[PDB]
Design a protein around this ligand. Structure first.
Ligand SMILES: Nc1nc2c(ncn2[C@@H]2O[C@@H]3COP(=O)(O)O[C@H]4[C@@H](O)[C@H](n5cnc6c(=O)[nH]c(N)nc65)O[C@@H]4COP(=O)(O)O[C@H]3[C@H]2O)c(=O)[nH]1
Ligand SMILES: Nc1nc2c(ncn2[C@@H]2O[C@@H]3COP(=O)(O)O[C@H]4[C@@H](O)[C@H](n5cnc6c(=O)[nH]c(N)nc65)O[C@@H]4COP(=O)(O)O[C@H]3[C@H]2O)c(=O)[nH]1
Lengths: 101, 101, 101, 101
């Protein structure tokens, strides 16, 4: 399950798998995807994790709001880093692998 | 509150403000920051928005988990895009502004 | 040659092909890859496109320097944008296609 | 010249300075900007570093072509990585500094 390209890593991420690069050397890091959802207008007022300016703007829309899926990283520090992005090096790399489990 | 550089936009984003580029022409788009949080190990099992493989891995850690703040975009489509990233063009741009409210 | 995923776009980019997303609507934009090269230490002093601080640092290395391949965009404005990066939306998109030629 | 925010790092990069994060621990890495240029249509055929499909497309334009400035990284491996991008962590970090020289 190794020597994968970025595209293969991405297809595994969309399947809820965890992936990593060999070149990230034994630091326990991996990437994963968090699913999207559509939040009903009725539910939206209960969301804690939006700035008030944004929450007000969206409630004024008075409609259900779609939140997109996105990639996240479990860092060398053991934090969940929201919104992981692929460097040029990562996108072109041939050393990706799928973590077991 | 216009003709700002990316750095100024970023400092406004950390203040929970919404920011945008003039060069994004009247499509209603803006960037905002979602706050970080530390989730107690006791709370973590209740999280819906993590893949099961990741949720299991983290619960096995048996510790509180930090989730980082991250930038998000309200898109031209009216979706909340999690994990917005700055293109070269955005990082070097001098046409940022802070949205009122 | 359509309805491609990002991974397929990336494999085409590594083949020197030009690729684009349907969702970028008829603005003539495409992505391409610029090749890497290793520049001999003897050649390096002739490079115009490096800041002097960086050029001095590298010449002091007194060794050949590898420059990585990277993705670039031909923009809606008709500029070559060096160092194009894939948004969350792009990485997860299923509407990529290879441009003819 | 330390404890800088990303915006301050970016303003230094536009001045042709080299910048880095404390959290990148003594691996010699830094970021720098490569200048943009406008290449005359007459010069463009001589460019080695463009795929043939792209070079042909641009020459058919029969006009001068602008190439944008972009950020680059001198990596832990000692390679010049073209098209460096700022992670969420980097954009929000308060540990940037300007390298001397
Ligand atoms: N700062 C921070 N806190 C986090 C993070 N992940 C989880 N939490 C906290 O855990 C609570 C429950 O998360 P949930 O079960 O996914 O429950 C979430 C989830 O089901 C949904 N939701 C909110 N935003 C999104 C989103 O962007 N995508 C998806 N798919 N669902 C979302 O709304 C529910 C309630 O959201 P909240 O009120 O924010 O309530 C969240 C928030 O307080 C994170 O990355 N950062
Ligand atoms: N600002 C700017 N100018 C551009 C750009 N593309 C081409 N040029 C200009 O065109 C000259 C010739 O480019 P080349 O044929 O690729 O000739 C290049 C190429 O063969 C090589 N080289 C330099 N940097 C790189 C790199 O990052 N990657 C690769 N593969 N080759 C490089 O060194 C040769 C001489 O480089 P320069 O002295 O810089 O000379 C460059 C530079 O003045 C661009 O995106 N931005």
């Amino acid at each position: 399950n190794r020597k994968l390209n970025f595209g293969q890593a991405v297809e595994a991420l969309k399947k809820g798998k965890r992936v990593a690069r060999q070149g990230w050397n034994g630091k326990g890091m991996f990437i994963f995807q968090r699913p999207g959802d559509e939040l009903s207008k009725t539910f939206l007022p209960n969301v804690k994790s939006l700035p008030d300016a944004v929450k007000k703007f969206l409630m004024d829309q008075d409609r259900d709001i779609e939140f997109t899926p996105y990639f996240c990283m479990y860092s060398a520090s053991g934090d969940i880093v929201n919104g992981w992005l692929a460097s040029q090096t990562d996108m072109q790399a041939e050393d990706w692998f799928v973590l077991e489990d």
